[PDB]
């Protein structure tokens, strides 16, 4: 009965040269029992990407909540929300539930359309913002991901190289966690094209 580790799952985000990558596993389980091998944890509202680990009912609820909020934002502002602004919206929304929180570990990723700057950010369940140049990690194998990222990562990787680094970071971290894995997805995000790749990983 620990909400953050019932369903299991991981998200990782990295910055490269004029690009960002965000990746997640596909497992949804009920503790030991694997239930679904199609449960994606990365969503997008325009060009801003959000990965959410933790309790799966809150992952779904928050996705639906941010779609709702970014849709009204776009109608009133007459432009797509930017990563820096969306980060602040996520933080506000999570801290609104300070004494009854969503059991989630969200990760924002995207390129600012005006400045062209790669941007990533992570949050605790209470909405505290963790901004980073290099990488953000979240989920049941966050320890493993921290170890993989901190060793493998180097600055200013090209999109094709960054893909290899984030993929190996996620795969090897997931294989040391019981509640993570069962397939993986990697988003490579450039200024005005986005490639989505499904990784081949061990299915245990």
């Amino acid at each position: 009965s620990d909400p953050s580790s019932i369903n299991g799952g991981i998200v990782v985000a990295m910055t490269g040269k004029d690009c960002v990558a965000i990746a997640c596993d596909l497992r949804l389980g009920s503790q030991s029992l694997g239930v679904s091998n199609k449960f994606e944890k990365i969503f997008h509202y325009g060009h801003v990407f959000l990965g959410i680990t933790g309790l799966a009912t809150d992952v779904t609820t928050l996705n639906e909540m941010f779609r709702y909020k970014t849709n009204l934002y776009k109608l009133k502002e007459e432009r797509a929300i930017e990563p820096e602004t969306f980060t602040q919206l996520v933080s506000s929304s999570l801290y609104e539930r300070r004494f009854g929180p969503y059991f989630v570990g969200p990760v924002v990723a995207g390129i600012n359309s005006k400045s062209g700057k790669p941007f990533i950010a992570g949050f605790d369940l209470i909405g505290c913002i963790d901004e980073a140049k290099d990488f953000i990690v979240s989920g049941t194998a966050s320890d493993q991901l921290f170890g993989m990222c901190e060793s493998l990562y180097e600055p200013n990787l090209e999109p094709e190289d960054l893909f290899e680094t984030i993929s190996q970071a996620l795969l090897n971290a997931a294989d040391r966690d019981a509640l993570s894995g069962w397939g993986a997805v990697v988003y490579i995000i450039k200024k005005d094209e986005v490639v989505k790749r499904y990784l081949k990983m061990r299915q245990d």
Partner: peptide, 4 residues
């Protein structure tokens, strides 16, 4: 929580 993240602490400081």
């Amino acid at each position: 929580f993240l602490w400081x």
